[PDB]
Structures are given as structure tokens and as C-alpha cells.
């Protein structure tokens, strides 16, 4: 079923984006005075922070490219999670039809 493949595909893709985002953030932030997003372990925690849109404020980019990377993370995360919500709807809508005969 498409909605399930998509969900899954969306999860593997998000994990890729997170990892690539941790890498790209450090590359972008290092070199900028006062920057804090400069070691991979925390950067990875930051990407998870961003994609889930929780945004604590303990870490965030300050360079143009860092922020640009941050926007791809947010958007991939929002889109990905929004797709799970959508696939859960197709499951419910499908099951609610069965329960009515159709």
C-alpha cells in the first residue's frame, strides 16, 4: 500500500537528512566566531531538535548556510511527520469504510 511505503520511505529519508544535516551544520558553523553548533554529537541532537520542531534554544545556527541547512531539516521533519499523520488517515478512512460494508 502506497501510504505505508511512503511513510517508511519518509522515515529513512528523514534519518538521512538528520545525519547529513549534522555534518553540514558543523561545516557551516565552524569558522564563525561565537558559534556553538561545532561538534557532531550535539549537532545531531540539534537536528533532531529542529526536525521535530521542538527547538529548545540550547543550540542554533548563526551563519547563512547553517540556517539554510536548518531550514531543510525543519521542512524534512515537518513534511515527514505530516506524512505519517496522512497515512494514518488513509488507514482509518479505509477501515471505516470496511466497517460500513463498502
Amino acid at each position, epitope marked *: 500500500a502506497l501510504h505505508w511505503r511512503a511513510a517508511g520511505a519518509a522515515t529513512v529519508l528523514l534519518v538521512i537528512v538528520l545525519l547529513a544535516g549534522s*555534518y553540514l551544520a*558543523v*561545516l557551516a*558553523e*565552524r*569558522g*564563525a*566566531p*561565537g*558559534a*556553538q553548533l*561545532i*561538534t*557532531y*554529537p550535539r549537532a545531531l541532537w540539534w537536528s533532531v531538535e529542529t526536525a521535530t520542531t521542538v527547538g529548545y534554544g540550547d543550540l542554533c545556527p548563526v551563519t547563512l548556510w547553517g540556517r539554510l541547512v536548518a531550514v531543510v531539516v525543519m521542512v524534512a521533519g515537518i513534511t515527514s511527520f505530516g506524512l505519517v499523520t496522512a497515512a494514518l488517515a488513509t488507514w482509518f478512512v479505509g477501515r471505516e469504510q470496511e466497517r460500513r460494508g463498502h
Partner: antibody
Amino acid sequence: QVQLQQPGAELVKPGASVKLSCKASGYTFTSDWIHWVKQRPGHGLEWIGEIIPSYGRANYNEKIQKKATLTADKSSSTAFMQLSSLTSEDSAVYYCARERGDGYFAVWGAGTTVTVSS
Amino acid sequence: DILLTQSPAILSVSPGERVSFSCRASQSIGTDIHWYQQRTNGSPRLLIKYASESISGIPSRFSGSGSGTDFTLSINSVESEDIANYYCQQSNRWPFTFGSGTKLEIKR
């Protein structure tokens, strides 16, 4: 085994330029950064800059005059520091170190003693 | 850019005694401080990372503690092999920076 190998010494004439090397062995990750640290006799450690080999980007210390230019050779696992127009101020021991992107210098090289004399 | 203050610059302690090295940051940096040892003629060698984490191949004698702006490197029961220069290094904010250093000194 010796993770970072550096030449023992380099002699340079005021104004001339030298190119120091740092050969790495052992585990190498795409998340590695090579650092260069300058130490004058009797004094402390001074960070010069860093290079991310797997990508090739370099950042430098903004407070001190920029006399360095970092490059790296992915194939031979060698990091290079290009010092130009050296003066007596630039004579010192230059160490290279490897950081795994977690902020601390895991291993340092024996360091190359540079001397700027005529 | 973060300034790491190391004072006193020299420390004199007697054989077997406990010694403590101080490192203060000009702003809060969590536990992003690392310690290096450097003997006469040798290159620096990581002693403690992240203010208090052990490194393999280093006498259980060495420990560290602190968080925020005040950090300590302690040697329980000093001994001649520990005579050297000690530096702290921070990785909280770019660029990484080093302390000016503290020399250890034994009184026999």
C-alpha cells in the same frame, strides 16, 4: 603506531616561505579535522587553524596575522600548512593534531621546529 | 572569543601530596573543557576530556571536575613523572582556545 608524522625541522630565510607536512595513519573518518598549533620557546600553545580533509574547508585564527594556508591530500592522508614571508617572529614549534569532531585533540604530532634565520 | 585563565601559573607541592590546577572561563561553557599534559621537549598529551572523563592509558591518579566557568584538574598523590606544563582547552565555542598554562613543581 605513530598516528601523525611530522618533519623534525625546517630552516627558512626571512621573507621566504616553507610548507610543513603531517602524515596520518590509523583510523580515518570523514568527520576528521586536522589542527595546527604554534608554540614559541618558553611560551604556550597557540591555535592556528583547522582543515576538514573529506571536504577540504579551512578556518583560521582571526586575531593573529594570517601567514598560513591549509591544504590536504585525501589519497596520501597528508595535511599541509603553507607559511609565507616568514620573519623571526615565526620561528617556533608547529604541532599538528587530529580531532574527531568532538572538540579535543586526541593525538598530536612530534612537531616541526621551524627556524627563520639568514 | 573564550579566554581560559590558569592561575597560579606555577604550583609547588611535595611528593605524595594532592595537587589541584585551576582553569576559569570568561563565560559558561558547560563541561567542554579538556586537559593536556606536556613534559619538557615532548608534545601535548590528552589527560582528561569533557572536564571529567577518563582517557585510557593515563594513571588512575589523574581526575578532573567542574562545570560552567570553573574547572579543576587534580592529581591525587603527585610524583616526579608528573612534572610538566598543564593546559586546559575549550570546545564550547569557535575558535577552540587554550589556557596560558600551569607548571607543576615537586619539592623533595
